[PDB]
């Protein structure tokens, strides 16, 4: 019956499989995709979270980072009352609904906990706060805190780890202003696209991309993004699990900041899975 099944799928034309693809999702959601790597015991011996803290990471150099507004892009694909064509000034009613779709497959009590931490209890009805709040929920749950977990665990088992936050909005960006620096919009700069004369980037963005291309290939060359010996600029300190240092990739020079959304990921990485496994 198992081989009987796949044989029938192999006779279906490719586009019909693509048509029904999003239907197999369990519970309506955002930032969730039907067909992803499976923890089979072959390619992945165990869940990634298990593999991550009993791993072979000493001697490995890792460069990790996030954009300033990780969540915005995904809200227009499922969150109630969102669009690139208005301000997305949602109601509290819409905010609540969006939590259950931003954090799907989670108990009623767990969702109360998300609302507890991301609501502003002086201004629980304010649409602009609710908008950026739901952005942070989706951004922290899916990107920032999983990255922050990975960094410190690698660091703790002997990886040399460097961490950035990319917070520059391309003047070319077609997405509306309330999305900030959306998911995926550091790429153009890492690849030097500003250098293309066909494109309309600033002169001052051209120097930015050259500085990022320098960091990335300094890393590929040497495992250290830092300009070797160069003391004119601030140093980019490696991320440790104690001091938790990262840099801002900005049109300004390197600002070295401590703590990679610490209070949020305490909830996402430690308290929430306790709540989940006790209710």
């Amino acid at each position: 019956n198992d081989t009987e099944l796949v044989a029938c799928l192999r006779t279906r034309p490719a586009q019909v499989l693509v048509n029904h693809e999003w239907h197999v999702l369990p519970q309506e959601s955002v930032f969730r995709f039907s067909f992803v790597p499976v923890v089979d015991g072959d390619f992945l011996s165990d869940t990634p979270e298990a593999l991550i803290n009993a791993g072979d990471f000493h001697g490995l150099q890792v460069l990790v980072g996030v954009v300033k507004d990780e969540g915005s892009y995904f809200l227009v694909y499922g969150a109630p009352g969102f669009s690139k064509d208005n301000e997305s000034l949602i109601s509290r009613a819409e905010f609540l609904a969006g939590v259950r779709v931003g954090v799907p497959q989670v108990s009623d009590l767990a969702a109360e906990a998300v609302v507890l931490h991301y609501t502003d209890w002086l201004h629980p009805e304010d649409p602009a706060r609710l908008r950026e709040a739901l952005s942070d929920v989706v951004g922290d749950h899916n990107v920032v805190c999983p990255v922050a977990q990975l960094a410190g665990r690698l660091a703790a088992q002997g990886a040399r780890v460097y961490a950035y936050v990319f917070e520059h909005r391309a003047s070319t960006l077609s997405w509306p202003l309330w999305m900030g620096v959306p998911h995926g919009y550091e790429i153009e700069f890492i690849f030097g696209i500003p250098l293309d004369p066909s494109r309309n980037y600033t002169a001052e963005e051209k120097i930015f991309a050259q500085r990022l291309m320098r960091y990335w290939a300094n890393f590929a060359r040497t495992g250290d993004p830092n300009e070797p010996r160069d003391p004119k600029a601030p140093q980019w300190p490696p991320y440790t699990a104690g001091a938790q240092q990262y840099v801002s990739l900005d049109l300004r020079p390197l600002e070295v900041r401590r703590g990679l959304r610490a209070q949020a990921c305490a909830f996402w990485n430690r308290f929430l899975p306790k709540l989940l496994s006790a209710t």
Binding site: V6, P26, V36, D40, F57, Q61, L63, S174
Partner: protein
């Protein structure tokens, strides 16, 4: 000019000189690294490309792996810059190499890009992923590959010889094996490979850190806005059957 004819283990290739404000790099686009994963090979792990006679036209990008195409905002740039820019085909296991124009006389480190788009979309031939500027401004070797997305690369019925799952990752691994065997032909150093990727590509890089058979194929890792341990990049064997068997039912199978 003569640096546009190069020979990998599979056979001969013909490339293109590409233009940059700083000056040219020379690129090889659409190199076959797998036998086309189709017909009975749909859902199966990739096989390595059988060798070829003649010279392979490695001058344009090859097809994009079959995928959903975003229709939310039609014509909108921010939406469309991620949509495929080549015809869709299941015949899509092709990779590309950019190398500095006067080919490096000494072995130079290799950057390997893995694109994202939540494991249901993406292609190595998008304009944002263009390697000419990084290779000209920094004189590294850049490789990017295509890998199967959606059901074509990740439908799994765990336990069956017929949809073992993760075959889109096995596609990436096959490509990394390719660079171990052949990046020397372009001036690259097989002992200095750095993976980088964004979104699901960052998740993929992460998984290669955690799968022993991939650890011999690179030495460093950059992960941009993604991680293997997040809540969306993995599913359990039981969920995978649930989602696989529902597609099959939604489609008339049994």
């Amino acid at each position: 000019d003569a640096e546009l004819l190069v020979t990998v283990r599979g056979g001969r290739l013909r490339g293109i000189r590409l233009k940059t404000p700083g000056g040219p790099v020379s690129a090889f686009l659409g190199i076959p690294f797998a036998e086309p994963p189709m017909g009975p090979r749909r859902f199966l792990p990739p096989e390595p490309k059988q060798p070829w006679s003649g010279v392979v036209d490695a001058t344009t990008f090859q097809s994009v792996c079959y995928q959903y195409v975003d229709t939310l905002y039609p014509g909108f740039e921010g939406t469309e810059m991620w949509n495929p820019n080549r015809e869709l085909s299941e015949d899509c296991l092709y990779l590309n190499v950019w190398t500095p124009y006067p080919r490096p006389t000494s072995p130079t480190p290799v950057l390997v890009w893995i694109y994202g788009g939540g494991f249901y979309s993406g292609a190595s031939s998008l304009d944002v992923y263009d390697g000419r500027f990084l290779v000209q401004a920094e004189r590294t070797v850049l490789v990017s590959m295509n890998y199967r997305v959606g059901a074509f690369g990740f439908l799994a019925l765990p336990g069956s010889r017929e949809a073992p799952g993760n075959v889109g990752l096995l596609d990436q691994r096959l490509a990394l094996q390719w660079v171990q065997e052949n990046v020397a032909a372009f001036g690259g150093d097989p002992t200095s490979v750095t993976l980088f990727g964004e979104s699901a590509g960052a998740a993929s890089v992460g998984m290669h850190l955690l799968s022993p058979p991939s650890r011999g194929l690179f030495h460093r890792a950059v992960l941009q806005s993604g991680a293997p341990n997040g809540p969306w990049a993995t599913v359990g064997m039981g969920e995978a059957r649930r989602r696989a068997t529902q597609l099959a039912h939604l489609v008339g199978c049994p």
